Symmetry: C2
Subunit: 47 residues, 2 copies
Protein backbone atom coordinates (compact mmCIF):
# COMPACT_ATOMS: atom_id res chain seq x y z
CA UNK A 1 0.00 0.00 0.00
CA UNK A 2 0.93 3.71 0.09
CA UNK A 3 2.91 4.18 3.34
CA UNK A 4 3.83 7.55 4.81
CA UNK A 5 6.56 8.74 7.17
CA UNK A 6 7.32 12.26 8.31
CA UNK A 7 10.49 13.53 6.63
CA UNK A 8 13.73 13.43 8.62
CA UNK A 9 15.26 16.41 6.81
CA UNK A 10 12.49 18.86 5.85
CA UNK A 11 12.43 21.90 8.12
CA UNK A 12 9.82 24.60 8.63
CA UNK A 13 6.12 24.56 7.90
CA UNK A 14 4.98 22.57 4.87
CA UNK A 15 3.37 25.12 2.55
CA UNK A 16 4.54 24.16 -0.91
CA UNK A 17 4.56 20.54 -2.03
CA UNK A 18 7.78 20.72 -4.18
CA UNK A 19 10.28 21.31 -1.33
CA UNK A 20 8.69 18.53 0.70
CA UNK A 21 8.82 16.18 -2.27
CA UNK A 22 12.47 17.04 -2.86
CA UNK A 23 13.40 16.31 0.75
CA UNK A 24 11.54 13.01 0.48
CA UNK A 25 13.30 12.08 -2.78
CA UNK A 26 16.66 12.75 -1.12
CA UNK A 27 15.77 10.27 1.65
CA UNK A 28 14.93 7.47 -0.87
CA UNK A 29 11.15 7.91 -0.79
CA UNK A 30 8.93 8.09 -3.85
CA UNK A 31 7.03 11.29 -3.09
CA UNK A 32 6.38 13.89 -0.44
CA UNK A 33 3.32 16.00 0.26
CA UNK A 34 2.10 18.33 2.96
CA UNK A 35 -0.14 16.73 5.57
CA UNK A 36 -3.85 17.38 5.97
CA UNK A 37 -4.00 19.80 8.89
CA UNK A 38 -0.66 20.30 10.62
CA UNK A 39 1.29 21.09 7.42
CA UNK A 40 3.98 18.53 8.10
CA UNK A 41 6.00 17.06 5.25
CA UNK A 42 5.03 13.41 4.74
CA UNK A 43 7.22 11.16 2.60
CA UNK A 44 5.40 8.39 0.76
CA UNK A 45 6.48 5.09 -0.74
CA UNK A 46 4.89 1.84 -1.81
CA UNK A 47 4.85 -0.62 1.09
CA UNK B 1 12.66 2.33 13.43
CA UNK B 2 11.46 4.32 10.44
CA UNK B 3 7.80 3.89 11.30
CA UNK B 4 5.55 4.11 8.28
CA UNK B 5 1.83 4.81 8.58
CA UNK B 6 -1.10 3.88 6.38
CA UNK B 7 -4.78 4.48 7.10
CA UNK B 8 -6.58 1.22 7.95
CA UNK B 9 -8.30 -0.44 5.00
CA UNK B 10 -10.89 -2.18 7.23
CA UNK B 11 -11.47 -0.01 10.30
CA UNK B 12 -14.82 1.79 10.13
CA UNK B 13 -16.11 4.70 12.16
CA UNK B 14 -14.04 7.20 14.09
CA UNK B 15 -10.89 6.27 16.00
CA UNK B 16 -10.87 7.24 19.69
CA UNK B 17 -9.27 4.41 21.73
CA UNK B 18 -6.33 2.39 20.39
CA UNK B 19 -7.40 -1.30 20.82
CA UNK B 20 -9.85 -1.82 17.91
CA UNK B 21 -7.68 0.20 15.51
CA UNK B 22 -4.68 -1.88 16.61
CA UNK B 23 -6.64 -5.09 16.04
CA UNK B 24 -7.74 -4.12 12.51
CA UNK B 25 -4.21 -2.95 11.72
CA UNK B 26 -2.56 -6.13 12.83
CA UNK B 27 -5.34 -7.86 10.84
CA UNK B 28 -4.14 -6.00 7.77
CA UNK B 29 -0.65 -7.45 8.48
CA UNK B 30 0.74 -4.28 9.98
CA UNK B 31 2.60 -4.24 13.29
CA UNK B 32 0.39 -1.82 15.25
CA UNK B 33 -2.33 0.81 14.92
CA UNK B 34 -3.29 4.07 16.57
CA UNK B 35 -5.85 6.83 16.32
CA UNK B 36 -4.67 10.02 14.63
CA UNK B 37 -4.78 12.98 16.98
CA UNK B 38 -6.64 15.55 14.86
CA UNK B 39 -8.77 13.66 12.34
CA UNK B 40 -9.36 10.59 14.60
CA UNK B 41 -8.37 8.18 11.85
CA UNK B 42 -7.11 4.64 12.47
CA UNK B 43 -3.51 4.62 11.22
CA UNK B 44 -1.66 1.31 10.90
CA UNK B 45 2.10 1.28 11.50
CA UNK B 46 4.91 -0.99 10.33
CA UNK B 47 8.67 -0.72 9.91
CA UNK B 48 9.51 0.72 6.52
CL1 LIG C 1 -13.92 -0.52 13.68
Amino acid sequence: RQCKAESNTFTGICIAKPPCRQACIREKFTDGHCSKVLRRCLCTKRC
